Design a protein around this ligand. Structure first.
Ligand SMILES: *[C@@H](CC(=O)C1CC1)[C@H](C[C@@H]1CCNC1=O)NC(=O)[C@H](CC(C)C)NC(=O)[C@@H](NC(=O)OCc1ccccc1)[C@@H](C)OC(C)(C)C
Ligand SMILES: *[C@@H](CC(=O)C1CC1)[C@H](C[C@@H]1CCNC1=O)NC(=O)[C@H](CC(C)C)NC(=O)[C@@H](NC(=O)OCc1ccccc1)[C@@H](C)OC(C)(C)C
Lengths: 306, 306
C-alpha cells in the first residue's frame, strides 16, 4: 500500500497567509481573527540585522509604519506589540477564513507540515521533523520568513512553527507562535551554529513497525535485547537513547504487529551493526527517522498484511 | 537552502472533493461547476469487481441511484453518463469553490501532487512522479479512489490523475480526468502486473544540477561524454536513454551553473560506475529521480551558490 512523507492538506492555513511590509522589508504574516503575527525582524533594514535592539527599533514605529496585504486587500493596523520574537499587529478586519486553531510548542522528534510562502502567497507544502538539535531541514529562500508549520486534528489547526532564519549548514530555525525560539538561536546575524544532531530512535522503530504492517519482515531476527544493551549500541551509532517511555509509546504498534518492542530493538541493533545488505525497507536504503509513531498510525492500514 | 519533495498547496483542490455513494459502495468524487467526476467502479458491488460489464451495470441505474455529499450537504444528481473509466454526474448546484482549472494528461517522468481523500474528506498531500511504466508510488488505502493528482500554475489547477487501483507490488494506477488509464491497466480485478520500470535519467540530471545550484560540486569530474557512450552506461544501469531533447531541456539549468549537460552526464556516469563512496547529494545516499527540471527551477534559488 505505500508509505510517503505526507503533509496535512494546507487549505485552512492558506486562507490565513498575508504579506507584511515595514519600510522596504517584506515577509509573510499569519492572520487569525483580528491579529496578524509575523517575525519581528520585519522592522529591520538590512543594516539593522547584525545587532538590532528590537525594543529601540520598534518604539520608533507607528501603526501606519506597517502595511498588511491579504490578497489585493489592504488591512489597516490599529495596534501593535512585541511578544518575544514576533510582532502582533491588531488589524481592523477579522479574518473570515480563520479556522478553529490553537498554538502549540512542539517537542523534538515531532513532525509537522510547513506551508512555504512568499509575498503572502503559498507556494508549497512538505513535512518536517523538529530535530533533536532544534532545527528543521526545510527548503526556504529569501522572503520565506513568516511561513508556518502546523498539524491538523479533526478540523483544528495546531500552529507550531513560524520561520525566521537559516544556519550555515543549510538547516532552518524559527519560533513557536508565542515567539519563543526552538533551540538556543537568536534572530540576529551574529555567528551561530546548530549543535550536533542525533538520529531519532523512536521514529526509526515506528517506521520499522510501519514496514511490518505493510507486509515486510525481512529485517526481523530471533533475538531480543535489554534496554541497556540496546543503548550501548545506540551510543556508538549516534542514536538517541531508548527510554521506557519510548517503549510504552510503541505499545499500539507492537500490538498490531505482534512484535515486542525489545525484539524490534534487537532487529534495529542488527541493522545498525550489519547494514542493510543492499536491501530496502519501505523503499529506502537507509533507516528513516522523520515519521513518528502517530504518523505511522495516521497513514498505515489498521490491519497488518500478515 | 534545502531541497524537499514539495507538493502544491492543496486548498483549491480540497474545496472540490465530495463523497459519492451507489448502493453500499462509496468513494470520492471531484466537483467542478455542475459536474461530479468519479471512478466508474462506484457502480460495482464487491461481486461485480472481477469482470464487470460497465455498460450493463450502468443502464440499470437511475440518477437517484447516486448519493453525492459535499460536507453535510446532499447534491441532487440530475444526469449521468460514462466517459471511459469515469462517471460524470451532473448535479443541481454549481460548486461555488470551483477554481480556474483544466484537465491535462501528464507524460511519464512528470510529477504532480496527490490529495489523498477518504469519504470526501482530504487527509494528506504528497508529490508523486508518473513512472516510465505508468504507475505511481503513492500511499493509498481502501476508500481512496477518486482522490486526484494535480499541478498549480498561477491560480490555475491542472488536474491530471484520478485514483482507481493498487497492483500487487504495492504501486498505484489510475486515469486522467477524461477517464483514460495511464498504462495498459483496466479497472477490473483480473490479474495484472506493472511492467518493468526504469530510472528517469532526465530527472536524475536535473537533481544533480539542483545540488550544484545549492552549493555542492563534489561529484563533478574533468571528463565529458558523448550521448552514445553515456547511453551504453545507461543501458547497463537500467536508466532511460538520454536524448537530444533531454539535453535541450536541461539548457537553462546548465546555463545557471556553467556546467555543460554532457559534462554533467560524465559526472553521472562516474557515480553509476563508482558509487557515492559513502557521501550524500542534497542529503540523499542514492540518485533521486522524482524531480523534474521544472521542479528544480520552481524550488531552487535563481542564483547559484558559487
Ligand atoms: C527571512 C527573511 C524574510 O523573508 C524577509 C527579510 C524579512 C529569511 C530566511 C532565510 C533566507 C535563506 N533561507 C532562509 O531560510 N530570514 C533571514 O534572512 C535571516 C534574518 C535575521 C534578521 C533573523 N537571516 C538568516 O536566515 C541568515 N542567518 C544567519 O545570519 O545566521 C547567523 C550567522 C551564522 C554564521 C555567520 C554569520 C551569522 C542567513 C541569510 O545567512 C547565511 C549566510 C548563514 C545563510
Ligand atoms: C478504491 C476503491 C474505493 O475507494 C471504493 C471501493 C469503491 C481502491 C484502492 C486500493 C485499495 C488499496 N490501495 C488502493 O490503492 N480501489 C480498488 O479497490 C480496486 C478496484 C477495481 C474495481 C478497479 N482494486 C484494487 O485496487 C485491487 N487491485 C487489483 O485487483 O488488481 C488486479 C489484480 C492483480 C493481481 C491478482 C488479482 C487482480 C487491489 C485491492 O488488490 C490487491 C490484491 C492487488 C492489492
Amino acid at each position: 500500500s505505500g508509505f510517503r512523507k505526507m503533509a496535512f492538506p494546507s487549505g485552512k492555513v492558506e486562507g490565513c497567509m498575508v504579506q507584511v511590509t515595514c519600510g522596504t522589508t517584506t515577509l509573510n504574516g499569519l492572520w487569525l481573527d483580528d491579529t496578524v503575527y509575523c517575525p519581528r525582524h520585519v522592522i529591520c533594514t538590512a543594516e539593522d540585522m547584525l545587532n538590532p535592539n528590537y525594543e529601540d527599533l520598534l518604539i520608533r514605529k507607528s501603526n501606519h509604519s506597517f502595511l498588511v496585504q491579504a490578497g489585493n486587500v489592504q488591512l489597516r493596523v490599529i495596534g501593535h506589540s512585541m511578544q518575544n520574537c514576533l510582532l502582533r499587529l491588531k488589524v481592523d478586519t477579522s479574518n473570515p477564513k480563520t479556522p478553529k486553531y490553537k498554538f502549540v510548542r512542539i517537542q523534538p522528534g515531532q513532525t509537522f507540515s510547513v506551508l512555504a510562502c512568499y509575498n503572502g502567497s503559498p507556494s508549497g507544502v512538505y513535512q518536517c521533523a523538529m530535530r533533536p538539535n532544534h532545527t528543521i531541514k526545510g527548503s526556504f529562500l529569501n522572503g520565506s520568513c513568516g511561513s508556518v508549520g502546523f498539524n491538523i486534528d479533526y478540523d483544528c489547526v495546531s500552529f507550531c512553527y513560524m520561520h525566521h532564519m537559516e544556519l550555515p549548514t543549510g538547516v532552518h530555525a524559527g519560533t513557536d507562535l508565542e515567539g519563543k525560539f526552538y533551540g538556543p538561536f537568536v534572530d540576529r546575524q551574529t555567528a551561530q551554529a546548530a549543535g550536533t544532531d542525533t538520529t531519532i530512535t523512536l521514529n526509526v522503530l515506528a517506521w520499522l513497525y510501519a514496514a511490518v504492517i505493510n507486509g515486510d519482515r525481512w529485517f526481523l531476527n530471533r533475538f531480543t535485547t535489554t534496554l541497556n544493551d540496546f543503548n550501548l549500541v545506540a551510543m556508538k551509532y549516534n542514536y538517541e537513547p531508548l527510554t521506557q517511555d519510548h517503549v510504552d509509546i510503541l505499545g499500539p504498534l507492537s500490538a498490531q504487529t505482534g512484535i515486542a518492542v525489545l525484539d524490534m530493538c534487537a532487529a534495529l541493533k542488527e541493522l545498525l551493526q550489519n547494514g542493510m545488505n543492499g536491501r530496502t525497507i519501505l523503499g529506502s536504503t537507509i533507516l528513516e527517522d522523520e515519521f513518528t509513531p502517530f504518523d505511522v498510525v495516521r497513514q498505515c492500514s489498521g490491519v497488518t498484511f500478515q
